[PDB]
Amino acid sequence: PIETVPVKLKPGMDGPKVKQWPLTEEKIKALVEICTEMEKEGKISKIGPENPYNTPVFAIKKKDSTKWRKLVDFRELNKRTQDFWEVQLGIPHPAGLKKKKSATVLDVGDAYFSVPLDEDFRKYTAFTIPSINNETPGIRYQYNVLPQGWKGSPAIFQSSMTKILEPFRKQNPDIVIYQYMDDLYVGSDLEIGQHRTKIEELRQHLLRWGLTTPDKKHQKEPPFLWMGYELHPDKWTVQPIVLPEKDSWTVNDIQKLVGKLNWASQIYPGIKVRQLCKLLRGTKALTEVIPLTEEAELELAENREILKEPVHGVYYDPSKDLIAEIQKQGQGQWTYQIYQEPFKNLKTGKYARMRGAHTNDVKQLTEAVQKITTESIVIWGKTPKFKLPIQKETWETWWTEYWQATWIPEWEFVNTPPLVKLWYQLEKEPIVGAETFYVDAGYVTNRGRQKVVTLTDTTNQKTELQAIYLALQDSGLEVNIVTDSQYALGIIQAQPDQSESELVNQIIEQLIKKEKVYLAWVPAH
Amino acid sequence: IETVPVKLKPGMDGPKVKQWPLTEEKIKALVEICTEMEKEGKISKIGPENPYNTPVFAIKKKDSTKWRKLVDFRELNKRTQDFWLGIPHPAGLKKKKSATVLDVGDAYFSVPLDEDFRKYTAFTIPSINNETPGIRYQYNVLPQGWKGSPAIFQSSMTKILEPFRKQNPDIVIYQYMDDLYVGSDLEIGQHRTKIEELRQHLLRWGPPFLWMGYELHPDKWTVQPIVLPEKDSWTVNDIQKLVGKLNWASQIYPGIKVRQLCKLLRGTKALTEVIPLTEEAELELAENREILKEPVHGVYYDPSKDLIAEIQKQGQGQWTYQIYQEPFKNLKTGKYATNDVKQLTEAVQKITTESIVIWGKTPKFKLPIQKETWETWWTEYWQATWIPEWEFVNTPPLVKLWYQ
Numbered sequence: 053p054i055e056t057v058p059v060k061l062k063p064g065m066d067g068p069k070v071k072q073w074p075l076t077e078e079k080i081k082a083l084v085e086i087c088t089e090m091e092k093e094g095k096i097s098k099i100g101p102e103n104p105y106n107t108p109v110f111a112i113k114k115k116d117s118t119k120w121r122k123l124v125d126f127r128e129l130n131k132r133t134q135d136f137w138e139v140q141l142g143i144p145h146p147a148g149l150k151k152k153k154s155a156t157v158l159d160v161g162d163a164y165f166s167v168p169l170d171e172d173f174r175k176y177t178a179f180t181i182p183s184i185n186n187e188t189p190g191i192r193y194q195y196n197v198l199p200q201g202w203k204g205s206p207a208i209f210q211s212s213m214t215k216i217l218e219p220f221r222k223q224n225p226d227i228v229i230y231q232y233m234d235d236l237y238v239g240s241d242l243e244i245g246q247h248r249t250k251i252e253e254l255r256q257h258l259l260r261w262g263l264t265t266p267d268k269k270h271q272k273e274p275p276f277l278w279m280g281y282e283l284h285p286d287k288w289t290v291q292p293i294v295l296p297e298k299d300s301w302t303v304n305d306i307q308k309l310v311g312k313l314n315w316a317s318q319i320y321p322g323i324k325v326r327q328l329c330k331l332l333r334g335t336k337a338l339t340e341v342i343p344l345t346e347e348a349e350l351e352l353a354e355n356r357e358i359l360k361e362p363v364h365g366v367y368y369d370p371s372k373d374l375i376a377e378i379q380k381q382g383q384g385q386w387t388y389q390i391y392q393e394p395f396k397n398l399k400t401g402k403y404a405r406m407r408g409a410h411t412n413d414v415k416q417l418t419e420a421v422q423k424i425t426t427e428s429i430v431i432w433g434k435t436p437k438f439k440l441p442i443q444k445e446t447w448e449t450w451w452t453e454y455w456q457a458t459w460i461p462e463w464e465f466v467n468t469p470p471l472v473k474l475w476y477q478l479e480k481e482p483i484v485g486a487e488t489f490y491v492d493a494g495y496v497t498n499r500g501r502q503k504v505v506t507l508t509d510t511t512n513q514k515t516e517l518q519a520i521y522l523a524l525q526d527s528g529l530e531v532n533i534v535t536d537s538q539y540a541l542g543i544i545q546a547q548p549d550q551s552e553s554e555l556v557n558q559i560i561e562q563l564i565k566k567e568k569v570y571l572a573w574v575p576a577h
Numbered sequence: 578i579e580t581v582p583v584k585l586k587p588g589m590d591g592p593k594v595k596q597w598p599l600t601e602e603k604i605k606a607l608v609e610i611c612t613e614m615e616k617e618g619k620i621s622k623i624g625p626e627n628p629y630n631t632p633v634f635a636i637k638k639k640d641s642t643k644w645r646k647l648v649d650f651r652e653l654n655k656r657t658q659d660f661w662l663g664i665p666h667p668a669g670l671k672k673k674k675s676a677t678v679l680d681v682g683d684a685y686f687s688v689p690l691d692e693d694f695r696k697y698t699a700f701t702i703p704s705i706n707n708e709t710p711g712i713r714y715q716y717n718v719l720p721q722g723w724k725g726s727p728a729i730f731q732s733s734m735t736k737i738l739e740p741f742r743k744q745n746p747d748i749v750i751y752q753y754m755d756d757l758y759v760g761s762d763l764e765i766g767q768h769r770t771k772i773e774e775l776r777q778h779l780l781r782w783g784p785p786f787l788w789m790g791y792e793l794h795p796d797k798w799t800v801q802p803i804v805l806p807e808k809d810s811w812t813v814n815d816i817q818k819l820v821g822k823l824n825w826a827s828q829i830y831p832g833i834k835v836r837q838l839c840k841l842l843r844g845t846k847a848l849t850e851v852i853p854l855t856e857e858a859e860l861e862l863a864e865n866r867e868i869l870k871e872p873v874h875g876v877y878y879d880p881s882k883d884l885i886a887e888i889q890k891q892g893q894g895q896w897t898y899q900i901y902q903e904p905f906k907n908l909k910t911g912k913y914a915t916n917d918v919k920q921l922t923e924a925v926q927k928i929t930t931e932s933i934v935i936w937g938k939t940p941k942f943k944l945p946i947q948k949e950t951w952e953t954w955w956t957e958y959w960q961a962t963w964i965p966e967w968e969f970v971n972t973p974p975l976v977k978l979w980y981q
């Protein structure tokens with residue numbers, strides 16, 4: 053059969069020693085029946101009073117039958133069981149797959165119950181079936197196989213399934229299997245019958261080790277609804293997405309919507325949730341009703357239309373290259389789509405991540421490129437060729453002068469407005485015949501000019517930026533500004549073009565307008 | 578053979594480090610590599626009853642078309658017991674004119690690893706798009722890159738090197754992890770031959786070159802002193818940049834005075850307005866200039882303290898680094914002059930190699946780059962067999978201004 057996986061309890065801990073709750077003579081009867089069958093099948097074994105351990109058991113009738121189901125509470129044993137290597141915590145994103153002529157999912161009936169348990173560990177799996185009549189005491193058992201509900205069952209099962217599957221996989225490279233909990237998904241490019249044939253070889257190979265699965269008659273067929281998706285043998289999409297037509301919206305409704313709207317973005321290009329999100333400002337309760345703004349209904353309405361028309365992503369062709377294309381959808385908003393054949397989208401997506409209170413498009417687009425790259429390596433194990441709306445000259449100019457190291461794969465400029473550029477650049481050397489402002493909230497110039505404005509509610513850092521703003525404000529098309537604020541300096545030297553702070557945006561505004569600006573720092577006192 | 582029992586620092590448990598996503602190419606490489614190491618029993622697949630994990634990478638060998646498997650045993654080494662006879666750091670190495678580095682990691686693969694420690698060496702070969710479980714393994718032999726491996730092989734090592742060491746004691750030989758640092762002052766030609774001989778003198782018992790196979794030259798390493806602008810005329814701006822740098826540097830060399838220079842800065846003059854220098858100011862600058870000509874006195878290296886390194890991107894393919902243990906108290910300072918990441922990684926390896934050679938330990942780096950970027954590309958340019966520790970930072974535009 054299958055090689056047993058040795059298990060141990062966490063160091064310095066003893067097995068579970070927890071009382072069996074009182075049961076109904078009815079439930080006792082049920083369990084005894086259930087447990088006897090199990091013993092006859094070898095899944096468990098009566099034990100002697102030699103075993104001091106115990107885990108509770110109770111009877112449950114699931115939704116549809118006047119028959120009884122057995123439940124054993126392993127919370128305690130689990131708190132006491134060693135950690136295992138994580139079960140598949142990572143999953144396949146649809147755009148990563150290669151299409152197949154046929155796909156078939158095989159539900160593995162009685163998974164865990166078909167796998168032996170480490171002899172030495174069985175003792176900790178002890179439970180008891182109370183006796184109906186008092187003076188006549190209860191039945192003690194221990195598990196011989198993976199206890200459903202136990203800590204290591206999933207991991208140990210996955211593990212075993214793999215060893216079992218290996219051989220077959222080798223005798224059948226023309227076949228692909230993705231294990232996932234109890235299901236087994238199998239794709240091939242074999243002709244229908246040819247495929248449906250192997251599906252049957254497999255079942256046999258599995259049945260060889262007692263594992264049972266559903267018959268062609270009873271199998272689930274593509275499309276495969278899985279993890280919020282709709283998988284066809286040749287294409288994919290997010291399952292069905294319908295937007296409500298309510299006239300009254302609560303913070304919670306809006307949150308759900310934005311959330312569903314978010315989901316869609318990975319495949320439906322152009323979804324926008326900016327205006328909806330705005331509706332959440334200042335909200336005081338989940339049940340608070342917010343009225344939609346002219347701009348928010350347009351968006352909802354616009355999105356509704358997008359979702360009406362289904363779209364479907366194609367699969368990955370490992371024989372062809374990956375192309376990633378990125379566009380600015382708005383300030384802070386970026387969109388991209390990865391395709392191999394022109395517009396033949398594998399995936400698409402957005403990026404709003406603003407890293408730092410201040411930024412410029414060159415910095416952000418670059419980060420966009422990094423997120424996409426990371427994503428790709430995870431899905432296709434390679435980086436895509438990029439199609440970017442920025443010129444190398446621009447890129448190089450920014451790159452070359454930014455303190456942080458950065459690197460963008462191979463990219464090709466694409467003239468798809470809007471084009472990202474630097475709205476301005478600080479002069480590298482002080483400007484001749486340009487007035488010089490010494491700011492500290494006020495300024496003093498080489499030309500005698502001054503303004504000592506006094507702000508209220510202002511922070512220490514925010515007061516510094518104000519001075520500069522003043523200087524900028526009042527100066528001509530060329531200015532030399534001298535400050536002692538290393539903070540302001542860094543901000544501006546970073547050359548942001550967008551900011552969370554209004555003040556900063558005002559300055560940026562001034563900055564774009566100027567002809568040449570030279571900013572310099574000097575020690576305080 | 579007989580395995581020497583190794584244990585983690587008391588109370589500590591094994592590593593459970595996440596594996597960073599790998600490119601198919603690197604994945605294919607590691608598979609090829611591990612499949613053969615398995616056939617030869619160096620490694621074995623493992624079960625779910627092992628929860629530990631260490632990251633593996635694939636890097637290229639310089640001047641070799643083969644891939645090297647690189648296991649990030651950084652967290653493991655940290656939780657591994659110290660070792661209680663040591664082969665201390667030969668101060669004589671830094672002085673040597675020429676030094677070559679050789680990868681001797683293959684030596685370890687002849688010594689078994691204590692059966693009870695093996696579990697902690699678990700590492701995993703990731704699968705593209707998670708379509709498969711991920712091949713899980715653990716070591717049976719001493720693994721390359723673990724701090725225990727050099728220790729446990731010390732004996733067997735000194736043995737094989739006693740002859741060359743006495744039949745050639747003009748050569749200094751330092752071992753650090755998978756590396757062997759061979760130093761001398763012979764001619765670069767003599768060096769290469771004496772080297773080759775040790776290669777076979779090693780082959781005799783059972784070493785491709787490291788750091789491009791290439792050479793090293795520790796004699797020619799020098800500190801990058803803080804420098805000042807030496808210019809024709811001095812404008813108001815020039816002088817402010819000057820005072821600022823000076824003021825900053827004053828915290829290290831308290832002998833720096835700015836008084837006279839700060840006096841030329843009275844009034845709110847036009848930044849471009851040239852300022853002739855007074856006599857006092859002229860002497861002041863000169864003195865400051867003299868003080869900076871050499872590293873501050875009093876800075877000694879403490880074996881019990883971490884060795885820190887900071888890098889600054891200057892531009893045009895130029896970087897500046899500083900190795901210290903305490904703020905402003907630099908043990909060393911240097912310069913280094915493709916793409917940003919490729920450079921940085923070459924620099925990091927360079928600075929690490931120096932740390933090893935000079936002090937016998939790796940520095941803890943502070944890099945000016947975003948994590949995801951580094952994680953993404955570092956293995957594409959990396960060639961060392963060791964991995965320094967690192968963290969990521971936001972370089973203050975002033976510090977850069979104050980260097981180079």
Ligand SMILES: CC(C)=CCOc1cc(NC(=S)c2ccoc2C)ccc1Cl
Nearest residue numbers: 149150152155228230237239283284285
């Ligand atoms: C993740 C999942 C449910 C996969 C099964 O669905 C499909 C998977 C593929 N193609 C591949 S490469 C495949 C087949 C079995 O397992 C894998 C990873 C194609 C179409 C569908 Cl409908």
